[PDB]
Structure 1
Amino acid sequence: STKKTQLQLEHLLLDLQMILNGINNYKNPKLTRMLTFKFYMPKKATELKHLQCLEEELKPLEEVLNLARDLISNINVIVLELKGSFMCEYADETATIVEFLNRWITFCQSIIST
């Protein structure tokens, strides 16, 4: 079971990085506008069950991306199966997509570590 859990986190991890990598590649003017959009961050993220804060922001992430269906689709399956279908509490300060994706990329790394 533990190994199955790990592999899933790694795919999730890879996934978020590919979306971030493609964003960084954009031409600055495009990146400028895209950076104006705001995302919501979790107050805490240490348990697999916190992965719900991510789920609630997938739609927004999908939408913004659109303006710049399958990549996000995978992340959805992973999250749904990983956390198991807890009230997610957000921070006061909103963040940029780059910040957003970084936060969760670290999350996955921290968990895989344990």
Structure 2
Amino acid sequence: SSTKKTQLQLEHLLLDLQMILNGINNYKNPKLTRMLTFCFYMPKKATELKHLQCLEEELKPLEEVLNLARDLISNINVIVLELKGFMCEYADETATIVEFLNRWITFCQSIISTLT
């Protein structure tokens, strides 16, 4: 019931990020070009729960980029705090919101695989 809960917490996180990615790729979004000009930071390594601190630190720019077009941001925040309860090392190369979301979706799938 503890491992399952953790798994469910990650599943919601995964889905939340996907919903953001979907709303950005919707042809109804009139600000995709502007959104892509935003710069996001990515962790050098992303293989451990504690690395979610790196995601948490970016929720602000995340909210701002989406606001260009939240109930989801807050949901992510809650999950993240539940998973990691660490000093992040970020890569030099910044990423677009699309790359940023992909990377974390991939991180979620990885961790979910591990604890199943």
The Cα of 1:28 is off from its aligned counterpart by 7.7
Return closer, same or farther for 1:97/1:8 CA change in 2, 3 Å cut-off: same
Q: What value does the CA root-mean-square deviation take over the aligned residues? A: 1.3
Contact 2:37 2:96 in 1 (8 A): yes
* Cα displacement string for residues 15-67 of structure 1 (whole angstroms, at most 9, x for unaligned residues): 00000001011458621111011100000011111110000000110111112
**TM-score, length of structure 2 as denominator length:** 0.92
CA distance in 2, matches of 1:20, 1:29: 14
CA distance in 1, matches of 2:52, 2:81: 9
CA distance in 2, matches of 1:13, 1:28: 22
Q: What residue number does 1:51 align with?
A: 52
CA distance in 1, matches of 2:15, 2:59: 16
CA distance in 2, matches of 1:61, 1:49: 20
Q: How many residues align?
A: 113
The Cα of 1:8 is off from its aligned counterpart by 0.2
**TM-score, length of structure 1 as denominator length:** 0.94
Contact 2:31 2:68 in 1 (8 A): no
Return closer, same or farther for 1:65/1:29 CA change in 2, 3 Å cut-off: closer
Q: Report runs of 4+ in structure 1 exceeding 3 Å deviation.
A: 26-29
For structure 1, the residue ranges without an aligned partner over 5 or more in a row are none
